[PDB]
Amino acid sequence: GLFGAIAGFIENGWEGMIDGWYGFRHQNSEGTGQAADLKSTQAAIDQINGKLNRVIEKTNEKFHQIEKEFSEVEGRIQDLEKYVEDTKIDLWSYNAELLVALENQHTIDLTDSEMNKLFEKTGRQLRENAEDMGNGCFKIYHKCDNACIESIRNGTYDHDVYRDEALNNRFQ
Amino acid sequence: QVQLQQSGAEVKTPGASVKVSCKASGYTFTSFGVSWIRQAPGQGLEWIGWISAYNGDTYYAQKFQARVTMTTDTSTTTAYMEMRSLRSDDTAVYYCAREPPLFYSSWSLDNWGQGTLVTVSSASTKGPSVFPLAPSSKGGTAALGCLVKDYFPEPVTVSWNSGALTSGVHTFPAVLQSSGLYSLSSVVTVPSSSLGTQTYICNVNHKPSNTKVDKRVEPKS
Amino acid sequence: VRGLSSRISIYWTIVKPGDVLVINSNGNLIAPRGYFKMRTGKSSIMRSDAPIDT
Numbered sequence: 001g002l003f004g005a006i007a008g009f010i011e012n013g014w015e016g017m018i019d020g021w022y023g024f025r026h027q028n029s030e031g032t033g034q035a036a037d038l039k040s041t042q043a044a045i046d047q048i049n050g051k052l053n054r055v056i057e058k059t060n061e062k063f064h065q066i067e068k069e070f071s072e073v074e075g076r077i078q079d080l081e082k083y084v085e086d087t088k089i090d091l092w093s094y095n096a097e098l099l100v101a102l103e104n105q106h107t108i109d110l111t112d113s114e115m116n117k118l119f120e121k122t123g124r125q126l127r128e129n130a131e132d133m134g135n136g137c138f139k140i141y142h143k144c145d146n147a148c149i150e151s152i153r154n155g156t157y158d159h160d161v162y163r164d165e166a167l168n169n170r171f172q
Numbered sequence: 173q174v175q176l177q178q179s180g181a182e183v184k185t186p187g188a189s190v191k192v193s194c195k196a197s198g199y200t201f202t203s204f205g206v207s208w209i210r211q212a213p214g215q216g217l218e219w220i221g222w223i224s225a226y227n228g229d230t231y232y233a234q235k236f237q238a239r240v241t242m243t244t245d246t247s248t249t250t251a252y253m254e255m256r257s258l259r260s261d262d263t264a265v266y267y268c269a270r271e272p273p274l275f276y277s278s279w280s281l282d283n284w285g286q287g288t289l290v291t292v293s294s295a296s297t298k299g300p301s302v303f304p305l306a307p308s309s310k311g312g313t314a315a316l317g318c319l320v321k322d323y324f325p326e327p328v329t330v331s332w333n334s335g336a337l338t339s340g341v342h343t344f345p346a347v348l349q350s351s352g353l354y355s356l357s358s359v360v361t362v363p364s365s366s367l368g369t370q371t372y373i374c375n376v377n378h379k380p381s382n383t384k385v386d387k388r389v390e391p392k393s
Numbered sequence: 394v395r396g397l398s399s400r401i402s403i404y405w406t407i408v409k410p411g412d413v414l415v416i417n418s419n420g421n422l423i424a425p426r427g428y429f430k431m432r433t434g435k436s437s438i439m440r441s442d443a444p445i446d447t
Contacts, residue, residue, distance in 0.1 A: 015200050034272050
């Protein structure tokens with residue numbers, strides 16, 4: 001992608017996350033777990049849906065049509081009819097091909113973006129109590145039980161509480 | 173189509189062992205876990221345990237901690253559940269259901285195997301005896317049937333006129349007698365008039381005992 | 394064709410409101426019995442052998 005997160009520094013996807021597009025896996029004293037993140041999953045979904053509807057909306061062509069097939073050779077007028085229709089068809093084919101390409105490149109870049117944003121957000125929350133391992137995982141330098149992990153996932157995590165423990169653990 | 177395919181029904185005597193199999197297909201097998209859950213006849217669901225086909229982690233309900241071990245085989249994409257030192261109350265249907273690859277994850281048991289019935293009994297195999305339930309009216313609607321008694325293990329098939337008779341028929345769930353053998357009755361409601369003309373034959377098929385029997389019902393005055 | 398070497402040439406004429414139709418012939422006329430009402434709209438024709446369904 002453009003942000004190099006998905007198929008980026010994030011090694012691979014989790015096929016076992018059936019409840020969302022993005023999420024957290026964690027490891028702590030209690031065990032390990034995997035949970036989806038609704039807010040970003042829905043961000044991406046909403047965008048892609050909006051896009052989809054923009055593409056399939058009111059795209060139908062309605063007006064009276066000339067004769068597009070001919071039994072007997074004629075001359076000028078028919079040569080012209082055919083030419084008009086061929087030109088039309090080529091232009092529309094091109095429009096379609098281009099549309100699909102731009103759209104798809106964008107869809108990929110945008111999803112990449114969402115992943116990366118969720119990541120930067122998490123990090124900013126963790127403040128100085130964690131380090132960025134580089135694979136999309138954070139090392140948390142204090143004991144963090146399940147409640148605390150959830151507190152990070154739901155945005156209420158208060159770093160000042162664990163700051164001393166964490167710093168102490170990082171720098172010695 | 174994310175199918176979990178479970179092994180055949182088992183019949184074991186107390187003290188024995190059983191190992192049940194689940195063959196998963198339609199998804200990447202090592203991306204998920206598998207969780208075992210049993211249900212005794214006419215009872216609720218009880219969670220036996222969980223295992224990760226991903227990291228090999230294991231979580232057992234305290235109850236089955238001792239007697240049960242869960243395994244997985246990645247090359248066959250297959251999960252196994254082994255229970256040792258069987259008692260008779262272990263009789264139940266055992267289900268294998270797909271779960272998250274890590275334990276403290278956020279969804280649950282999204283796909284279920286068909287389940288496999290494990291019966292723990294000291295009773296040796298036996299075919300059913302079939303007796304008639306004969307109609308008599310005090311010109312109306314009358315009832316008749318078949319008593320299929322003392323067989324083992326379940327199941328039993330029952331049909332009427334080799335399938336030609338359906339409407340008005342009721343085959344009751346088997347009941348388990350003190351002896352350790354099952355019994356059940358099949359019953360039909362038919363017009364009393366057709367009693368004297370048409371023939372009624374009940375076809376009982378007990379697969380495990382290799383028994384197929386046909387009986388008929390007449391009043392006998 | 395159809396057992397005859399003699400034919401008919403067909404012609405049409407549109408008459409607008411406030412205009413008159415005039416017909417003059419010394420022979421060889423297949424005359425109109427009246428007219429067809431002209432409508433403006435979305436109607437058209439199509440060549441197909443596809444069966445029609447409900």
